[PDB]
Design a protein around this ligand. Structure first.
Ligand SMILES: CN1CC=C(c2ccc(O)cc2)CC1
Length: 69
């Protein structure tokens, strides 16, 4: 088990915020809910929405983008 590779503007830690594309192809402010280090993916929670919408997204996915800062 190894750490997620570095990506600009994203911190791969629980509770860290970012923006993510949901399955309906729209971007939302989101937070990292869980990290699966073996599979290289994380469970993304879309802020304001039910946790039933949380999605597993691989840590290298272009469905993730950092917040503009
Ligand atoms: C993170 N995604 C946000 C919005 C969702 C949604 C919006 C409208 C609708 O009819 C059905 C689903 C899905 C979860």
């Amino acid at each position: 088990s190894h750490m997620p590779p570095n990506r600009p503007g994203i911190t791969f830690e629980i509770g860290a915020r970012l923006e993510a594309l949901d399955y309906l192809q729209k971007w939302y402010p989101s937070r990292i809910e869980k990290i699966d280090y073996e599979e290289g993916k994380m469970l993304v929670h879309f802020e304001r929405w039910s946790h039933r919408y949380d999605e597993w997204i691989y840590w290298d996915s272009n469905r993730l983008r950092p917040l503009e800062r």
